[model samples]
Target: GSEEVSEPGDANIFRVDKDSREVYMHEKKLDLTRAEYEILSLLISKKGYVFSRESIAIESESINPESSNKSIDVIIGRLRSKIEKNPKQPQYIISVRGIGYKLEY
Candidate 1:
């Protein structure tokens, strides 16, 4: 429709500012927790870059380095539930086999 605004950084990505945190989507503000924001921010910050589960765990404030990789999956699952149209088939956060995750946009 040519109605979209193209910003400088990450033209395909848009962030919605909420009361406490911001959400990345079609500029639609979403309610997210501290953990959710951190995970989403990490992926968006390094779009198209694959980060390992261990790396994700370390970056997340709610996750401990010693935590199992499953923890990262759990957090990712939760994030997808909130951000993705279909968490089962996520569009934004795509999982990399043998790797961790990456932002599709």
Candidate 2:
């Protein structure tokens, strides 16, 4: 019985049950798209680390829609829609000035 419970914090927070691909927040299950799952997975896997656009592109093929340049921003926005109480003022995902993005614990 060595299977680890990998949810970093809690189901109702920053963590997700990876095996189930289920993201929850504030005690509610968040319905996410495949791309959303991929992005969220990367963010939480290395929480608080800044991920550049290039890094995001390399780690995220599932997120880039055709003819898209702001796909990464789109993914983050979609996530904000689900996670942030006010997308205008984000809590979980924050921009790293001009570099990239970081996941706030």
Candidate 3:
């Protein structure tokens, strides 16, 4: 059977328009790339559900095949920079210690 992850409910601070592949924070469109959109869509697909770096890399087609955890980390970092008003303290994408990442709004 083919399984699918449904779109998650809107967060208090963000909203994703899958149809147009766009992301909005505070009702303002944030300039984002396809890779960033892919990652955000996945994380936002299941809010609060942790996803390993390997899983993310596998699920996100935009990532390089040879990418490692560090690359994913950097991508997440960049994503946060745009998504988070204060990148230093991210409120949406949370990192699990020694594990992976999850979307918590």
- Candidate lDDT values, in order: 0.57, 0.58, 0.60
Question: Which is better, 1 or 3, measured by TM-score?
Answer: 1
Worst 10 residues of 1 by lDDT: 3-12
Q: What are the per-residue Cα lDDT tens digits for candidate 2 across 1-105?
A: 575765434532455556566655442455456556555566666665786666666666664444335876776566567556633344555677647777566
User: What TM-score would you give candidate 2 relative to the actual structure?
Assistant: 0.50
Clash pairs of candidate 1?
Answer: none
RMSD of 3: 8.8
- Candidate 2's C-alpha runs over 4 A off are 1-22, 25-32, 63-68, 84-92
User: How high is the lDDT of residue 26 in model 2?
Assistant: 41
Q: Residue 19's C-alpha lDDT in candidate 2?
A: 59
- Write candidate 3's Cα lDDT for 5-102 as tens digits: 64533566667666555666553454456566565565555554776777667766565664457756776667667657633344555677757776
Ranking by TM-score: 1, 3, 2
| TM-scores for all predictions | 0.54, 0.50, 0.52
Q: What's the lDDT for candidate 1?
A: 0.57
- Which candidate would rank higher by TM-score, 1 or 2? 1
